[PDB]
């Protein structure tokens, strides 16, 4: 293991909010949100919630400072009294942090941090100062699902963050969503509609095989290619990979490009197995797993266990991914497991 | 300089022609077109033309043996009679030819190499080889032409590759095309309609800046990202960098993702300057000038010039861009020019 694994939460920790990416968690109209997703925080987990002092100046401003969304992340880590740190959302410009960031005083400020897709980016900041972090569940789009959590990412966030016992095997959602249903507060008692869902699919492989956890959403990882912010080289051996696709439902061919470069980096051969999470509207569904198999298939590597949609990545509900935490994908069973706490 | 410049080329001189990435060129009913290329660089140039030994096995060969393809380079190459290389035509997957180039054959033969789009990575081999080589035109686009070359064409073959002559300003062309004329030989008389060009349009900037040459397809150098293939950082200083858009028409989102991703490189901070092809079609013409703003904006790069509209990329005709040939963009003037000569 070459990550830090953070401590566990428990009832009365202190909780941070951060924008990192989008800035709409202060928007106006989007503000009950929030809410919202805090009072789940506060209510079914039994947390205490702090929002980082920018983090709710709204869409604007957090668009034009991409250095005081990086600040926000630095209060929050350098505060001893936070113990997790959970992005509102995500986005598509963290990337401009970049210029901004601390990385020693995250070394030096191990908490959990938590949040998806453009989240990626924050989670990179997080993993090149050698802290394990959660690719997981945020404020807007899974605390403050309207109604009630769903049950599946409460347990999930129980087993991930507040218990030190062995994950283990993680078994698929009963049912999915990522049903469009505005931000209006008037919404707010609108139950979304929920889908069947049938488990997990096994698209090549005959083996059981076991590494540790690095990827993220795939369009953002195309984000921090070539840049300082990559992962070194240690990192991808052995690994399991994971990938989800965004809400941006990229077309196919980008899958296939976005996975040659995974091959030409030499990420792919030194893989001992991919996780890819359900598109978002289930929208490409088929056609991924085409170029997926092909981008296999030229590169000789038609026995890489590669397992297809999994509970993460941009519908709801979330199960959680600790970064570089042993993973293991059964391929006789079809089944995924994390062989270890995600928390200390 | 860091890449050497090939020799001058000359009528009675050899040139090899290959296909790095789609094979079409030897495809049954698009054998006429390759040999319709060939016709004009025998009569127009009064050049030998000899195909490589893999390079007319159709396009299921062609995609299925990259290492075929790659070997059909280096013969060219390490063939001392050969003066000069054309590619047949781009495609989307010769980032696949990686692992089996000889970069050494390529440096211990220096000679022009020239083709477009896809034909970036093979450019990079070069680059990586040492050798400068030529963004421009190839044999099934542009040699091929129905009924006559576009002069436009010939003249900046000449200028670039038969004289070792200052290039110096390169004018726009007069008109443009990019009709979808089908490579069916029933075809061969109907000459492809043209469309008034306007000239470059400047998008920012307010002084006069020389830097050596680099770029490609920006669909393209994507697949390099982060690889072996990626020129070192010494090659980006005080560069003008040359983007252009392919004939899938990228959506104007991924212009700005990949931009972003060059200013994450510190690539964008090393610029002098930067010239953009004309789209294919001109399809989002004024919403890439938008995205390409809003990056310079987010990076306080606003006064870094940058010149659109150029006669490079997936539109008919086109002038020739020499990797690490020292160019100048004047603003006040509105123009382009090339400072030194593409061959020796």
Redesign the interface.
């Given at each position: 293991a070459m990550l830090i694994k953070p401590k566990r939460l428990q009832p009365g920790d202190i909780v941070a909010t951060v924008s990192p990416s989008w800035g709409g968690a202060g928007d106006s109209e989007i503000r009950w949100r929030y809410e919202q997703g805090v009072k789940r925080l506060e209510e079914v987990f039994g947390l205490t919630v702090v929002p980082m002092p920018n983090s709710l100046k709204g869409s604007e401003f957090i668009y034009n400072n991409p250095q005081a969304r990086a600040e926000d992340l630095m209060t929050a880590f350098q505060d001893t009294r936070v113990k997790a740190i959970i992005a509102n959302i995500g986005g598509?410009?963290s990337?401009?942090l970049?210029p901004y960031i601390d990385f020693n005083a995250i070394r030096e400020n191990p908490k959990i941090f938590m949040g998806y897709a453009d989240v990626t980016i924050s989670h990179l900041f997080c993993h090149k100062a050698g802290l394990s972090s959660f690719y997981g569940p945020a404020i807007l789009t899974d605390f403050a699902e309207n109604v009630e959590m769903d049950p599946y990412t409460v347990e999930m966030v129980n087993r991930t963050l507040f218990s030190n016992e062995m994950i283990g095997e993680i078994q698929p959602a009963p049912e999915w969503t990522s049903e469009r249903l505005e931000w209006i507060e008037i919404n707010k008692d609108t139950r979304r509609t929920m889908q069947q869902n049938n488990g997990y699919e096994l698209l090549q492989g005959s083996t059981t095989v076991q590494g540790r956890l690095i990827g993220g959403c795939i369009?953002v990882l195309?984000?921090?290619?070539?840049?300082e912010?990559?992962p070194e080289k240690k990192h991808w051996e052995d690994s399991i990979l994971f990938f989800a696709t965004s809400e941006?439902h990229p077309e196919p061919?980008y899958i296939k490009?976005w996975l040659?470069?995974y091959a030409?980096?030499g990420i792919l051969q030194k893989a001992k197995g991919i996780i890819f999470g359900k598109p978002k509207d289930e929208m490409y569904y088929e056609e991924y797993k085409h170029e997926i198999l092909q981008v296999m298939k030229?590169?000789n590597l038609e026995d890489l266990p590669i397992l297809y949609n999994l509970n993460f990545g941009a519908t709801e509900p979330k199960f959680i991914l600790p970064y570089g935490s042993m993973a293991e994908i059964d391929c006789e069973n079809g089944s995924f497991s994390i062989l270890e706490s995600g928390v200390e």
């Open positions: 598509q410009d990337i401009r970049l369009e195309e984000f921090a290619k070539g840049t912010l990559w941006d061919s490009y040659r470069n030409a980096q030229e590169h």
